[PDB]
């Protein structure tokens, strides 16, 4: 009450919760990026110089 | 000695929320690292 508003309690608890969620989300994004199809070039039809069709 | 929050409507709800968050995180992590391939 001296230097903080009433909602500071909720703000601090939500900040901790959001920080944990953000760490988990960052880990998830890193893993997904490193396991993505764009990274590993999967299901991407690479264009060929002579356009051969199997 | 009772916990400071003892006798509060919000205690069960907050515990529940924390558990649900945790379960969701766990399942998602498990999927990405084990089943997504």
């Amino acid at each position: 009450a001296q230097i903080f508003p009433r909602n500071a309690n909720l703000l601090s608890r939500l900040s901790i919760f959001a920080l944990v969620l953000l760490v988990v989300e960052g880990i998830l994004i890193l893993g997904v990026y490193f396991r993505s199809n764009y990274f590993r070039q999967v299901n991407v039809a690479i264009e060929q110089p002579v356009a051969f069709s199997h | 000695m009772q916990p400071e929050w003892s006798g509060d409507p919000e205690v069960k709800p907050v515990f529940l929320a924390v558990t649900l968050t945790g379960m969701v995180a766990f399942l998602l992590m498990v999927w990405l690292f084990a089943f997504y391939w």
Binding site: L10, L14, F17, A18, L21, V24, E25, L28, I29, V32, Y33, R35, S36, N37, Y38 | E10, P13, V14, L16, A17, V18, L20, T21, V24, L28, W31, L32, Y36
Partner: peptide, 25 residues
């Protein structure tokens, strides 16, 4: 508050599903 925790969890879940779909797009 539990309501805000659940709302944040739902937002994080939606973001995680979008990211997961983006990987296999």
């Amino acid at each position: 508050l539990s309501r805000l925790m659940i709302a944040g969890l739902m937002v994080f879940l939606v973001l995680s599903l979008v990211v997961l779909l983006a990987g296999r797009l």
